[PDB]
């Protein structure tokens, strides 16, 4: 039930079949309901020396998967009847064979705004919809139901489905593609199209309040400021930008009367706190004094 | 059937403002991208901006930042654009499927 | 920003001699590529989205491919009405950009 492959198996390329299961197979899948995927036949080989297929109640798994299997290993005419069923294999999955592809793309900082081609079916009723599937994905090495457009018409109508993908963080990579959701029909079923994986990234935007800041002088005239990077930088940060102004001294000074006697001048639940300072990190969304533009570093 | 129809011609003082429609037909305002484009007599396209209608959500080219402002009125399902030299037609499209008829911009004293 | 380099900038030709244009881009754009077409009365079609996908009642005459970094618009086989401007459009990043155009001119 947990397998969705068996790639897993990564250096397999023989099984001999010395001793085969009962019926004479030396390859049996039976009721792996998740099982989607065999090995990638665009780069592994496997050989089977003897025996047969037998291949029964994998409702994820293409039957092209299981004919690919057959030409790989060398076993194509050893299966008889009901050795593969055609019912109980791949009944329940996407053996999506027609491509989409993106007619329209559109960036926001917290959005991305996708068209796509329209995909009939034959029997365009048994169009179910369509399906949208995006992650965050930093390395390019890799839900949303989507209603049927507006079909009796074909004329000038840009009946392009779409979406508007709102959650987003900004500066991410997204994998996305898009799937056609349709009905196995009583004759020989139309397995329809998916798009192919294309990454989109947000756009940058305005970064998160540099963190824990601290102001330290080690000397009669250094200090020595530190600090932490944005806890959503939203984008590459190239600096920081420093401003220093000299605060003139308190008014009030120049006119008290020390010498008289009060002469004291200055010597100059836990994760309800968590949630607290939380709360205002969720509510933060001319003239010249001296600065610097610090370039990699996270400290002046 | 997608239509987006465009105002102008519009002779203009130099130094003044302008500001051209482009009034959208056949199609739901409010769900679709409207991009702008600039073509100086002869020359090629050059993109201008976007703006989300149903949002009010906009986007800009660093050469146009200053020169042009866009607006839409989802009440009257149309779409604006106001500017800030010579002739210049000025487009509008939906998502660049759709394009509008071209608005010529001429400026003259 | 993404440079798309069209080629050629004018090209002469006949009816019924198929021609092709080109558009390197800068950067890969993924097939992200329009291919727009400019009537005399300034109206712009749009002919070709995502690299090779054709417009409703765009003419079966017009395609268009991709290999490598160069993406075309092949005519078939020109008809009098084909001899416009045409430009392409990357719309895979940030700021849309266009090719420099190309003026179809009749051979004579």
């Known amino acids: 039930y947990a397998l969705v492959s068996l790639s897993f198996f990564r250096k397999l390329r023989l099984i001999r079949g010395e001793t085969l299961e009962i019926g004479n197979y030396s390859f049996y899948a039976l009721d792996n309901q998740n099982l989607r995927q065999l090995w990638d036949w665009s780069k592994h080989n496997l050989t089977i020396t003897q025996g047969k297929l037998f291949f029964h109640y994998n409702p994820k798994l293409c039957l092209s998967e299981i004919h690919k299997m057959e030409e790989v290993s060398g076993t194509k005419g050893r299966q008889e009847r009901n050795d593969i069923a055609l019912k109980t294999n791949g009944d329940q999955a996407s053996c999506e064979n027609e491509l989409l592809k993106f007619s329209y793309i559109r960036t926001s900082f917290d959005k991305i705004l996708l068209r796509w081609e329209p995909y009939w079916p034959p029997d365009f009723r048994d169009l179910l919809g369509f399906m949208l599937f995006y992650k965050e994905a930093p390395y390019q090495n890799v839900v949303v139901d989507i209603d049927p457009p507006l079909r009796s018409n074909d004329p000038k109508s840009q009946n392009h489905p779409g979406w508007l993908m709102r959650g987003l963080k900004p500066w991410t990579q997204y994998a996305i593609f898009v799937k056609t959701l349709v009905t196995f029909s009583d004759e020989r079923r139309t397995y329809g199209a998916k798009s192919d994986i294309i990454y989109v990234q947000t756009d940058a935007t305005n970064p998160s309040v540099p963190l824990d800041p601290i102001s330290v002088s080690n000397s009669s005239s250094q200090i020595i400021l530190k600090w932490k990077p944005p806890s959503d930088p939203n984008g590459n940060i190239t600096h920081y930008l420093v401003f220093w102004e000299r605060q003139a001294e308190d008014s009030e000074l120049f006119e008290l009367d020390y010498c008289l006697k009060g002469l004291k001048l200055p010597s100059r639940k836990e994760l309800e706190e968590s949630s607290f300072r939380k709360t205002f990190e969720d509510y933060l969304h001319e003239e010249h004094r001296p600065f610097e533009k610090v370039v990699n570093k996270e400290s002046l | 059937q997608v239509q987006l129809q465009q105002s102008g011609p519009e002779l203009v003082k130099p130094g003044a403002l302008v500001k051209i429609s482009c009034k959208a037909s056949?199609?739901?305002?409010?769900?679709?991208?409207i991009h702008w484009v600039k073509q100086r007599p002869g020359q090629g396209l050059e993109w201008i901006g976007w703006?989300?209608?149903?949002?009010?959500?906009?986007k800009y080219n660093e050469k146009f930042k200053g020169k042009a402002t866009l607006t839409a009125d989802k009440s009257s399902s149309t779409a604006y654009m106001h500017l800030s030299e010579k002739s210049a037609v000025y487009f509008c499209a939906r998502e660049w499927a759709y394009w509008g008829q071209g608005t010529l911009v001429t400026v003259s004293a | 920003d993404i440079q798309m380099t069209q080629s050629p900038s004018s090209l002469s030709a006949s009816l019924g001699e198929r021609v092709s244009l080109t558009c390197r881009a800068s950067?890969?754009?993924?097939?992200?590529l329009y291919w727009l077409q400019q009537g005399p009365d300034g109206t712009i079609k749009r002919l070709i989205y995502?690299?090779?996908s054709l417009d409703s009642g765009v003419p079966k005459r017009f395609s268009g491919s991709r290999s490598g970094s160069d993406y075309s618009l092949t005519i078939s086989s020109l008809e009098s009405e084909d001899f416009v401007d045409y430009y392409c459009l990357q719309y895979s990043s940030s700021p849309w950009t266009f090719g420099g155009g190309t003026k179809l001119e009749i051979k004579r």
């Open positions: 703006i989300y209608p149903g949002d009010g959500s906009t």
């Open positions: 056949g199609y739901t305002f409010t769900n679709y991208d």
């Open positions: 995502a690299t090779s």
């Open positions: 950067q890969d754009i993924g097939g992200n």
